[PDB]
Symmetry: C4
């Protein structure tokens, strides 16, 4: 297969409508789902010519840890619905490639099983502050023990988003909105973030910030990064594309913490634009799932290599031999 | 049924083309009809994270009177064409929900019958200043006697709008433009508003203002609110979407009177954007009619509950525990 | 028939493709043809409420002469291809309605025959400065003798525009680009306009100006008006919609001469927007031809009455009792 | 055939999908391919009236050499795939017309064979700085010996662009990305341009610059022109349309060297807009290939004459008797 969009159409075939719709969906009318993609098109590239691009180096670092490319795997729940191997395939592919994986909450594999499947792979844990604070506490402890290098706290889901396709055909695995309400605490504030900060010395990244002020607030509370994310357009519909908010957030943080982006990344040029606008790395969600549905582990590895090569070429044609050379002048919005 | 747009398609089935077309239509080319919806999409949401949203309270007040949500039923004529119960179903549903209903002119039920059907429901009367001033005078007196809490004077209809579908297949119930010309006085000015002001101490709201200067003029003449309305895009085609004019009107009124909006509200996020831009409450027109055509009273109650829950979720995901927390920074226009 | 767009589809039926295509076409890719219509949609209306609109008066004046409405018939060549009566039907309909007609060059009726068919109708002559100056001279003399009240000099056609459909199927009546090259002088400058000015004391209007500087130049050379026109999008494709250039031209002329508009007028609201932006009257081209193809004289009269009533309603709903009340604040561009 | 777009559809018929797709393609999603065309539509024309346009003269000069029109043939590889005569047909047609041809790298004809086929035709050579510097050196020497009047150095291809259709069906003539990597040196910098400058006293034009700073840098290094080009949208997708970047480049160069444009030119009005924005001449790529596929030499000659006449008419209708009269005020962007 040639590009990421071919993988989605192949996953559509191999997967039951019920399950493909769950992975594909955005919230309500899917205005933001469409805009995550479209916004990248509105950012035009202004490449520099005649720079030595012979040995294009894609390596960078995420929160102190080296990675082979600024493209890492984002947290998506219930990966075993896409392929029998699920999270284990994902993490093994990340290991092959030298990139990191964010293990999702409601993963279809344990934190321990993931660690063992990819012992040398870079691993981070995505987590919610649950009603039962002890559950959050145990997860953090387990992540520390099992060699996970960061905690991503998702802050944009006091309740689960209203995804129309999920209701039209009811859904379950051994609706979804009720399970979230029982477990995830809608009352949480910056005080509950102070608690999480004292709970661990691991780098914590606030996942799902879309506002400048909230970003400054994250910095003030001693967190170590912002993942600019609209939760794959699955939460509040009508929020801007994450590539559009990224500038405001990059500027608000004033270089004090690393800023990352997910939502809409499907091409090498997407990666380049995000890094030009100031993101340190990007995360992909759906593309990994589509890879998984096609060929499990080899599917994920293929998806990440297609993105890797596309990013290498896009870097080369922009006159960027390494990631440190990328700058704001490479992009301008129409 | 899941969302408001499903109700319209169901009403299309159950209703004769002649009658569905009457409820659906805008004026001339329906440019504004389309824009009432589309404009909401152009207003993007910038939600705050990590605010306590455990006990989301949707209650507010309209012209001194408490309501359960900032979503109230707008005036639409001839509701018995949609369902045998018409206005009686509508008002009973509003009573169940704790919201208000604007009784329309040319209602298929009397002011007295409506009052009795929903004695404890919040009720307002929509009215025109008719040629025969006594007819207007009696209606006002009746509204005072029957427990109606406000008068909405529609000021945007000196003549009836040209709705193409209404002419293509002639229309009637025991064309429409002739009945309006006989009854509604096209000569009326702010002097006729001075008259209406002295006529009653009930709160009067100017319904159908689209200009800043006209809004200031309404304030100057001692009226108690502005309903920013383009009459469901049924009057002058080529006027802006009401969500677009709302800022100019909110600013022109300088907090001296409450400002409301109708036209295009179909989703919880619509409600949120209107309130963010400064409206106190919104009115829905067509959605109530579609509810009525589907299941009469239960249909209207369902429509309003779908909107209610959608607004609750949208509020929660924006970090708004109550309506007093909503502010201008929640929205920015593309 | 209800609106102007219904007339075009009826004319499509009754006319041979060859002849309908000639009347319909724009130049090259028809970018401007589309934009003449579309631009009107981008101008939004901001109506005033509660102004006495009981006796809406549509009468105004064109170059000193009273007319019943600011909607007049523009010059279109070869009207007998659409209906046996051609120009005679057109002028008789204008007489019925109390509006003016611009007789076209290459009319399928003589200046004398037109004058006799509508003796009391307001008549102007459209003219080119031909290579043979005597032909232009005779036409001017004839127009003076036959009671024509103005000369419209078309200045945007040194050569005929390239209309793709006209070449695909060759065309003729007892190609077209060769006849223009033989007759119309491509060398003409403002000096040839000085000549035309001294030739007659009739009001002369420069037809087809699209630039501010050219408009000032027309004023300087003692002409009496500007018809802002892109020749029905038939000349240079990729020029702006005439409703877009009208502001720049209205401002450049500084109230020294009357300014008119044609191109794209199909609805009453079009007329209103043009007058709001400062035009004194508008001309319609194609709609008259479509009227003619449907019912000859009654067809033209119907077309003009539909426009008349639509303009009356649009005026009323904007709060304009007469044309003198229309002002720039009625419109704002998106 | 009437216009350039008819030629593409005819070439689609006569050519195998494999070969048509190679000539047609852009890079990745073809965002820029579409925008090269679309951007011209966004530049509107503001024609002057009543200027003597009797003897419209289209002649100008490219790098000191007279040409019959500001429309020249751009470099496209492997022209014999389109027609048995290939480059020989192209150059003979340019000779007939009095315009120049840029001979492409990977031409299906030798530099010597081209020179002989069109001895009196204006000829320039397009070239890459190859890994083997001697190959570049020989080409330059040969171009000097064989009467070529300029060297166009393509600077936007350190690696070949990723054209999806080329991979879907593999391609070859007695994939393509491997041949480029073996031959074209991705390491080259402005120092390798200094080398090329000392290598010849022929005018050198930097082909494929899209940035203002890079243009200034080209000027500083003693080059003689900039060809504003995005390589027919075949390299980095998501770069602006060349007509959009042309202003920034024209201004950055401050009249010190001639600036040219290719990419998207299909109509006479395109040529006019490019020259209005400050380009001295434009190059066409694909249209020549489509001409070639239809009727070889007569096909190319037809294509160039259609463009020539369309440009003549567009010039005339703008009030431009010659190319020296074209100015920035003729265009404004929407
Ligand atoms: C199938 C699905 C499940 C997801 N599950 C989670 C989750 O459990 N926790 C979380 O923080 N984000 C979750 N996300 C959001 C992703 O972390 C990420 O923000 C999003 O997928 C990025 O957008 P993309 O899919 O266009 O790459 C999920 C997204 C999808 C598509
Ligand atoms: C069927 C129909 C009848 C209406 N009748 C009246 C009316 O009698 N008086 C009035 O002031 N507005 C009337 N309106 C306008 C509504 O009060 C309200 O402005 C509009 O419906 C809001 O737009 P919406 O339908 O998109 O919610 C009517 C609208 C419709 C659709
Ligand atoms: C069929 C056709 C013939 C025309 N003939 C002339 C003409 O002879 N002289 C002239 O100045 N304009 C001519 N025009 C342009 C019209 O005067 C007028 O500018 C144009 O029709 C207005 O645009 P509209 O058709 O959208 O109303 C012609 C237009 C059309 C459609
Ligand atoms: C078939 C094809 C082959 C091309 N080969 C070359 C080439 O060998 N060297 C080069 O500098 N540009 C090459 N180009 C780019 C052209 O020189 C030119 O930039 C482009 O075709 C202009 O865009 P247009 O096709 O829309 O006119 C090629 C373009 C195409 C379509
Ligand atoms: O966007 C998404 O799909 C999600 N984000 N956080 S949980 C989630 S899906 C989900 C999976 C399992 C359970 Cl129990 C509840 C919810
Ligand atoms: O938009 C609308 O449908 C309306 N607005 N005011 S009356 C109305 S419809 C109407 C109903 C009944 C009569 Cl008698 C006249 C008109
Ligand atoms: O737009 C148009 O159709 C026109 N404008 N001026 S003449 C014309 S059409 C025409 C009619 C007759 C002759 Cl002989 C030449 C040309
Ligand atoms: O856009 C294009 O098609 C191109 N630009 N430079 S070479 C080229 S195509 C090509 C032809 C032949 C060989 Cl060997 C390699 C590449």
């Amino acid at each position: 297969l040639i590009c990421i969009n071919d993988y989605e159409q192949h996953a559509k075939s191999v997967l039951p409508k019920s399950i493909y719709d769950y992975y594909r969906s955005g919230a309500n009318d899917e205005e933001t789902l469409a805009d995550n993609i479209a916004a990248f098109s509105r950012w035009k590239l202004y490449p520099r010519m005649l720079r030595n691009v012979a040995e294009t180096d894609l390596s960078t670092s995420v929160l102190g840890q080296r990675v082979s490319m600024p493209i890492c795997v984002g947290a998506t729940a219930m990966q075993r619905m896409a392929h029998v191997d699920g999270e284990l395939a994902t993490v093994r592919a990340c290991q092959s490639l030298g990139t990191g994986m964010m293990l999702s909450s409601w993963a279809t594999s344990s934190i321990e099983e993931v660690a063992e499947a990819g012992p040398e792979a870079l691993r981070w844990l995505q987590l919610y502050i649950y009603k039962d604070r002890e559950v959050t506490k145990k997860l953090v402890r387990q992540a520390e023990k099992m060699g996970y290098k960061a905690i991503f706290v998702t802050v944009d889901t006091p309740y689960l988003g209203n995804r129309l396709d999920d209701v039209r055909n009811r859904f379950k695995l051994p609706g979804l909105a009720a399970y979230v309400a029982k477990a995830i605490d809608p009352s949480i504030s910056w005080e509950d973030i102070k608690w999480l900060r004292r709970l661990t010395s691991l780098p914590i990244v606030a996942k799902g910030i879309l506002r400048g002020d909230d970003a400054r607030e994250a910095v003030k509370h001693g967190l170590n990064g912002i993942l600019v994310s609209n939760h794959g357009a699955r939460q509040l519909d009508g929020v801007p594309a994450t590539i559009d908010v990224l500038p405001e957030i990059v500027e608000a943080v004033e270089g004090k913490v690393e800023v990352f982006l997910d939502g809409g990344v499907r091409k090498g040029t997407d990666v380049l634009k995000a890094l030009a606008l100031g993101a340190k790395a990007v995360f992909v969600g759906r593309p990994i799932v589509w890879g998984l549905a096609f060929q499990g582990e080899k599917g994920v590895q293929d998806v990440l290599e297609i993105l890797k090569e596309e990013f290498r070429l896009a870097m080369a044609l922009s006159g960027c031999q390494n990631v440190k050379v990328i700058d704001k002048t490479l992009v301008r919005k129409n």
